[PDB]
UniProtKB/TrEMBL annotation, chain A:
CDD domains found in the cross-reference section: GLECT (cd00070)
Protein's UniProt name: Galectin
Domain of life of the native organism: Eukaryota
GO molecular function: carbohydrate binding
Keywords, ordered alphabetically: Lectin
Domain Galectin: 3-139
Residues annotated as binding beta-D-galactose: 55, 66, 76
Keyword Metal-binding: no
UniProt keyword Ion transport present: no
Length: 139, 135
């Protein structure tokens, strides 16, 4: 049952472009007494409370995306998806384009998020949750 | 530097990136060329779903099917400064290839043959090829 995995939470300094890809490979856990969550932050890395141009949060059939700007969270973009099957390893992709983030799970489009803060201000990628994280790749 | 021509077996998806880094040469008696093939890898003369070609301020993109090239898509660009390192990106999406040079969008190429049929990446030209990466 043993397998190699990355620290959780996982941090990585980044510089995004208009043609930039993050590929996460992970598996949801079965936490004691709660549903597993998954959270990916494209943050400014300016410390606690610093801006988060794009947070991707998933739990129990629900995706919530949002932006933290000047200590304030904005209007949520919220959808239902069946893409994250518990116990099944998944591949989660973020594509950074000039106009939006595009999100894919297992090679299928899930949702898109129009930029609310400049992609150029993202400095820190942050992956965490009730997951076993096996790889995080960026190009 | 890397072999030139450069070959790499590939398997594309609807969210797939090729990043090429290279220095454009200044050959004595010609303008340096650059060529990238997204091909089926079915032997010489096999179909080529997408060829990207650059020389002398001109890009030409086309598809080789059943031994014949289709209607080109041709355009001008100043992005390849001769003598300078460049970075060339192909983004494979469900509907098209997207081309970027030095983090700037250049042109797009709607799929004519299925992206799933591409098996071999070929990169060549009057370049010093320093790296080729895919995700």
């Amino acid at each position: 049952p043993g397998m190699d995995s990355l620290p959780n939470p996982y941090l990585q300094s980044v510089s995004l472009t208009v043609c930039y890809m993050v590929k996460i490979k992970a598996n949801l856990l079965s936490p004691f007494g709660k549903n597993p969550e998954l959270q990916v932050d494209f943050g400014t890395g300016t410390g606690q409370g610093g801006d988060i141009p794009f947070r991707f949060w998933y739990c129990d059939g629900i995706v919530v995306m949002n932006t933290l700007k000047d200590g304030s969270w904005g209007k949520e973009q919220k959808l239902h998806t069946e893409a994250f099957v518990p116990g099944q390893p998944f591949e989660l992709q973020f594509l950074v384009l000039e106009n939006e983030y595009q999100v894919f799970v297992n090679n299928k489009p899930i949702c898109q998020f129009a930029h609310r803060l400049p992609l150029q201000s993202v400095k820190m990628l942050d992956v965490r949750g009730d997951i076993v994280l096996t790889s995080v790749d960026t190009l």
